Amino acid sequence: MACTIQKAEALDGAHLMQILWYDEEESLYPAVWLRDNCPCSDCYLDSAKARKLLVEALDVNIGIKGLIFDRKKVYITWPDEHYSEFQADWLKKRCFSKQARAKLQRELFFPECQYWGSELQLPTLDFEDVLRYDEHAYKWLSTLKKVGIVRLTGASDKPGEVSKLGKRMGFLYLTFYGHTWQVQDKIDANNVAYTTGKLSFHTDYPALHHPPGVQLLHCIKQTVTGGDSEIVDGFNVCQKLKKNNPQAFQILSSTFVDFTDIGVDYCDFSVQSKHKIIELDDKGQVVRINFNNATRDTIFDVPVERVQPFYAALKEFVDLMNSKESKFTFKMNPGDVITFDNWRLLHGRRSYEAGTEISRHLEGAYADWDVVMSRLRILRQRVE
Amino acid sequence: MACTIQKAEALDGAHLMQILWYDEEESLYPAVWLRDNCPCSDCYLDSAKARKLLVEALDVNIGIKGLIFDRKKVYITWPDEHYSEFQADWLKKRCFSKQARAKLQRELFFPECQYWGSELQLPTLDFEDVLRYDEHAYKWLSTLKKVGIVRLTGASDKPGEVSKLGKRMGFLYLTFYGHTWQVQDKIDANNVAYTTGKLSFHTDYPALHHPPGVQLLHCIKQTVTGGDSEIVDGFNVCQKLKKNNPQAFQILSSTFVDFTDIGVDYCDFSVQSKHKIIELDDKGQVVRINFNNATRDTIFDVPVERVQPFYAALKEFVDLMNSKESKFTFKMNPGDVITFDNWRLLHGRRSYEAGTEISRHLEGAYADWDVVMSRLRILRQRVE
Ligand SMILES: C[N+](C)(CCF)CCCC(=O)O
Ligand SMILES: C[N+](C)(CCF)CCCC(=O)O
Ligand SMILES: O=C(O)CNC(=O)C(=O)O
Ligand SMILES: O=C(O)CNC(=O)C(=O)O
Ligand SMILES: NCCCCCCN
Ligand SMILES: NCCCCCCN
Ligand SMILES: [Zn+2]
Ligand SMILES: [Zn+2]
Ligand SMILES: [Zn+2]
Ligand SMILES: [Zn+2]
Numbered sequence: 001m002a003c004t005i006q007k008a009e010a011l012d013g014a015h016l017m018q019i020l021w022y023d024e025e026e027s028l029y030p031a032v033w034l035r036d037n038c039p040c041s042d043c044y045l046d047s048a049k050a051r052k053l054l055v056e057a058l059d060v061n062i063g064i065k066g067l068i069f070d071r072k073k074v075y076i077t078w079p080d081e082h083y084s085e086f087q088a089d090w091l092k093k094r095c096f097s098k099q100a101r102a103k104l105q106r107e108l109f110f111p112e113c114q115y116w117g118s119e120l121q122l123p124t125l126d127f128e129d130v131l132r133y134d135e136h137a138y139k140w141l142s143t144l145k146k147v148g149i150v151r152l153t154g155a156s157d158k159p160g161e162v163s164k165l166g167k168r169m170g171f172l173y174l175t176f177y178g179h180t181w182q183v184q185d186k187i188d189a190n191n192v193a194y195t196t197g198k199l200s201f202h203t204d205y206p207a208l209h210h211p212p213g214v215q216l217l218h219c220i221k222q223t224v225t226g227g228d229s230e231i232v233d234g235f236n237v238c239q240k241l242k243k244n245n246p247q248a249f250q251i252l253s254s255t256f257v258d259f260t261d262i263g264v265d266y267c268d269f270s271v272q273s274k275h276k277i278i279e280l281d282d283k284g285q286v287v288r289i290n291f292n293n294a295t296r297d298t299i300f301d302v303p304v305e306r307v308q309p310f311y312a313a314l315k316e317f318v319d320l321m322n323s324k325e326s327k328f329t330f331k332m333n334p335g336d337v338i339t340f341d342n343w344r345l346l347h348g349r350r351s352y353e354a355g356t357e358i359s360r361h362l363e364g365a366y367a368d369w370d371v372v373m374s375r376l377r378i379l380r381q382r383v384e
Numbered sequence: 385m386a387c388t389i390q391k392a393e394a395l396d397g398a399h400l401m402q403i404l405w406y407d408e409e410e411s412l413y414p415a416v417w418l419r420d421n422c423p424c425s426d427c428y429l430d431s432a433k434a435r436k437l438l439v440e441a442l443d444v445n446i447g448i449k450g451l452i453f454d455r456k457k458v459y460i461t462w463p464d465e466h467y468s469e470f471q472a473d474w475l476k477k478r479c480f481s482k483q484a485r486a487k488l489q490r491e492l493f494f495p496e497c498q499y500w501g502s503e504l505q506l507p508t509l510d511f512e513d514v515l516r517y518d519e520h521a522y523k524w525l526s527t528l529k530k531v532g533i534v535r536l537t538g539a540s541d542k543p544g545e546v547s548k549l550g551k552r553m554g555f556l557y558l559t560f561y562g563h564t565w566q567v568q569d570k571i572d573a574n575n576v577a578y579t580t581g582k583l584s585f586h587t588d589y590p591a592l593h594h595p596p597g598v599q600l601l602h603c604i605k606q607t608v609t610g611g612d613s614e615i616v617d618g619f620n621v622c623q624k625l626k627k628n629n630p631q632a633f634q635i636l637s638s639t640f641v642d643f644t645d646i647g648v649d650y651c652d653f654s655v656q657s658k659h660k661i662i663e664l665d666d667k668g669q670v671v672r673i674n675f676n677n678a679t680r681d682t683i684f685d686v687p688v689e690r691v692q693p694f695y696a697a698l699k700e701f702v703d704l705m706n707s708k709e710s711k712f713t714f715k716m717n718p719g720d721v722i723t724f725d726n727w728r729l730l731h732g733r734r735s736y737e738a739g740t741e742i743s744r745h746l747e748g749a750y751a752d753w754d755v756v757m758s759r760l761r762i763l764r765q766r767v768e
Binding site for chain 2: 015016028029030032033036037045047048049050051052053054055056058060094096098101104105108109170171173174176188189190191192194195197198200208209210254258260262263266267268269270271272273282293294295296298299300301302303304307308311312314315318322368369370371373374377378381
């Protein structure tokens with residue numbers, strides 16, 4: 001009834017096609033869009049699922065010349081004699097109504113988020129299960145997307161585990177710190193992460209214009225002298241800030257802050273970026289946080305009168321993150337792997353004590369959100 | 385005279401430090417910024433060139449308690465008894481005046497562009513020279529940034545050459561099409577690039593939310609039956625469009641277009657993105673073009689009434705790109721490598737004839753602009 005065609009016709013100077021379905025709903029389709037998306041072998045490369053049709057071949061004033069239909073298909077002739085057939089279900093899916101468009105967007109991009117504070121039930125799955133089973137791997141990635149974090153238990157206490165997850169996702173995101181990297185105390189540390197010091201809430205790699213979307217951290221060795229993990233849901237914190245201190249929100253969401261990283265690791269590097277700490281989309285919704293206090297530059301490209309209020313704003317924000325209602329704290333054990341959204345969460349670590357031997361060792365890696373969402377979409381298809 | 389201190393004092397409730405230099409210029413430095421950027425070993429990790437100071441340790445209302453200076457340094461005490469020393473040249477570089485801030489930004493980010501049309505003198509260098517010599521590699525990357533394209537001659541007619549340039553830059557950008565990929569006609573092509581068809585002007589990989597910044601294409605085998613390259617300077621074209629058709633510019637710079645890519649190559653993939661074809665920064669300047677007509681989705685997330693004007697806009701834009709005043713066309717030979725800005729240029733290829741043997745073969749790869757700018761900054765330091 002919903003995907004079955006009752007009538008199809010050309011309207012509005014033949015610049016529109018109207019489909020009345022057997023459920024009584026009507027859908028409208030611009031003629032130029034139909035022509036642009038002709039699935040015939042001249043216009044569309046089936047092996048690539050891509051358009052061969054050039055913009056140059058498209059008449060933007062085109063009208064439908066003839067049309068006939070049955071219950072499952074419309075058949076169209078165009079003024080230049082080109083001929084196009086479209087399937088009902090294909091058309092219905094791509095319906096231009098607000099409701100149909102949003103439904104499809106939700107399927108494509110899994111936009112739903114569950115905001116949290118200190119009440120977090122840390123989502124947990126088994127590691128080998130996620131490797132072995134599509135049902136678990138699906139639960140893993142969809143929860144990662146929705147919640148911002150998933151902990152995997154029962155991995156080895158050995159290097160190479162995050163690599164396995166990278167292969168499971170697809171591939172990891174190479175940076176100047178390697179394909180994977182070792183978080184432990186280091187002589188002549190090129191990075192504050194590689195010392196025993198406390199790391200306050202940050203996101204990783206704001207020194208890059210495209211920070212890692214997803215972070216993986218696997219505990220190989222844990223100290224008893226400290227080293228507790230802390231996380232916070234940045235989207236939740238931003239929402240509170242806008243409510244509590246609109247002016248601090250406005251400043252943090254509009255001021256470009258310079259980040260830097262000069263050193264040698266996988267390779268030699270001199271990295272510089274500008275980011276707004278609270279990054280908004282065009283509708284004003286928070287879509288990324290860009291903030292590591294370690295790598296924030298001494299260079300600060302703002303007029304003198306904006307400097308102190310920026311700091312007063314940053315301070316309110318950090319104070320919100322440290323609030324007992326926002327942060328969740330936990331201690332990783334050897335065999336634990338945490339995988340999280342490095343665009344949304346901020347994460348941190350308590351100080352611990354240095355020794356002559358390595359008391360504490362994590363292995364980490366990153367992955368791009370597009371690579372992760374790809375595996376997510378494929379995994380959903382296999383399980384449903 | 386310019387970097388030598390004549391006087392230093394605390395002003396404005398000690399919330400500001402003023403430095404009068406021996407050239408008579410004055411510079412102003414917020415107290416909170418001085419404290420935030422104390423270079424002492426408690427506040428700053430020298431091996432990492434990073435801030436250890438936490439936002440939590442920072443009093444945003446702080447004032448300078450005491451100050452003394454000589455010609456090369458200021459020495460500051462803070463109300464909590466912390467103590468800070470700063471160097472004159474360091475301070476002067478980071479001066480908050482509009483002129484000083486922009487000077488430093490230009491050094492960091494090489495913002496200058498030379499716009500072009502059909503008059504292009506295609507910048508050309510030798511390949512082995514760029515590998516062997518920092519002076520040439522510097523000329524390579526700075527010209528890439530400024531002009532948007534550089535052609536390297538005298539490479540081999542063999543796979544593996546783009547890899548060498550990736551190592552010279554630092555590393556290449558892994559995608560679903562491999563670390564490097566082979567552009568040639570392919571049975572069951574997963575991509576229109578892998579056929580003999582014409583490719584109209586496009587940027588590569590808009591299906592990703594972070595498209596490759598830099599593209600490398602190396603000609604191993606060339607056909608005489610066609611295969612000419614075409615390029616266009618997208619920033620230049622956008623500028624003309626805004627002038628000629630503001631409404632088309634407005635539409636293309638505000639409408640989110642969906643891109644897609646489903647297939648198997650390096651790995652299996654289902655990729656989806658949304659981008660504005662003309663992407664602007666917060667000051668309205670064009671910073672990226674996101675447009676491949678092949679991978680533009682059949683899905684189009686706009687209200688029915690916006691569809692046809694979008695197409696009329698896209699059409700004006702493509703027509704501008706094809707104008708004999710904008711495009712530059714050339715034919716690559718075996719041994720040629722083109723390296724360009726895939727955020728600014730659009731590129732294309734003329735059709736050629738299929739055969740039983742491979743008549744035409746390119747090898748390509750990508751790299752991130754941050755990885756490229758890093759090598760650029762380091763190269764400038766070594767040559768100057
Ligand atoms: C974990 N680290 C040290 C190496 C992987 F990149 C990065 C720290 C985050 C940062 O430098 O922003
Ligand atoms: C050159 N290609 C086929 C493979 C490297 F990614 C990509 C074409 C550009 C696109 O699919 O957008
Ligand atoms: O060591 C930890 O627990 C946390 N480490 C980091 O957040 C890091 O290295 O960026
Ligand atoms: O084959 C060519 O000359 C150009 N190829 C491409 O632009 C591509 O593969 O994306
Ligand atoms: N069953 C309808 C088939 C229509 C084919 C038309 C060919 N021009
Ligand atoms: N030459 C000036 C040195 C100042 C040192 C001050 C230590 N509190
Ligand atoms: Zn067709
Ligand atoms: Zn971190
Ligand atoms: Zn200090
Ligand atoms: Zn291309």
